[PDB]
From Swiss-Prot:
There is a cross-link at residue 41 (Glycyl lysine isopeptide (Lys-Gly) (interchain with G-Cter in SUMO2)). This is Bromodomain-containing protein 1. It is found in: Nucleus; Chromosome. Highly expressed in testis. Residues 9-113 form the Bromo domain. Scaffold subunit of various histone acetyltransferase (HAT) complexes, such as the MOZ/MORF and HBO1 complexes, that acts as a regulator of hematopoiesis. Plays a key role in HBO1 complex by directing KAT7/HBO1 specificity towards histone H3 'Lys-14' acetylation (H3K14ac), thereby promoting erythroid differentiation. Coiled coil: none annotated. Component of some HBO1 complex composed of KAT7/HBO1, MEAF6, ING4 and BRD1/BRPF2. Component of the MOZ/MORF complex composed at least of ING5, KAT6A, KAT6B, MEAF6 and one of BRPF1, BRD1/BRPF2 and BRPF3. Interacts (via PHD-type zinc finger domain) with unmodified histone H3. Interacts (via PWWP domain) with dimethylated and trimethylated 'Lys-79' on histone H3. The chain holds residues 555 to 674 of 1058 of the full protein. The gene is BRD1.
Length: 121
């Protein structure tokens, strides 16, 4: 149908905007602490601690399959990256501190993304 196509065009455009958001959030992690999944070879107990692991590469695979229907779903995954890190790692660690900085800096990017998603529809 023509409606399914229009819906698909909106999804594609949401995907375009989320790709730009993702790039901007990932620039706030220049150490690449959150680039890849936590290694279960190197942290074998990780899933005893963290039930839903997340990282930027995993989000990127979902993004490119157009698997985010809305900004809320994308933000859920970003928040997992931060929140998982802040639980597994103690406050005095470079990991926890990187999560805090990513959260604070990403806040700005996400604030305007929400305005753009609402605005363009």
């Amino acid at each position: 149908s023509m409606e399914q196509v229009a819906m698909e065009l909106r999804l594609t455009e949401l995907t375009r905007l989320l790709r730009s958001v993702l790039d901007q959030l990932q620039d706030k992690d220049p150490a690449r602490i959150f680039a890849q999944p936590v290694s279960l070879k190197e942290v074998p107990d990780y899933l005893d601690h963290i039930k839903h692991p997340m990282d930027f590469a995993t989000m990127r695979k979902r993004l490119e399959a157009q698997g985010y229907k809305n900004l809320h779903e994308f933000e859920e995954d970003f928040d997992l990256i931060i929140d998982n890190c802040m639980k597994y790692n103690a406050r005095d660690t470079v990991f926890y501190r990187a999560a805090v900085r990513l959260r604070d800096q990403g806040g700005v990017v996400l604030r305007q993304a929400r305005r753009e998603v609402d605005s363009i529809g």
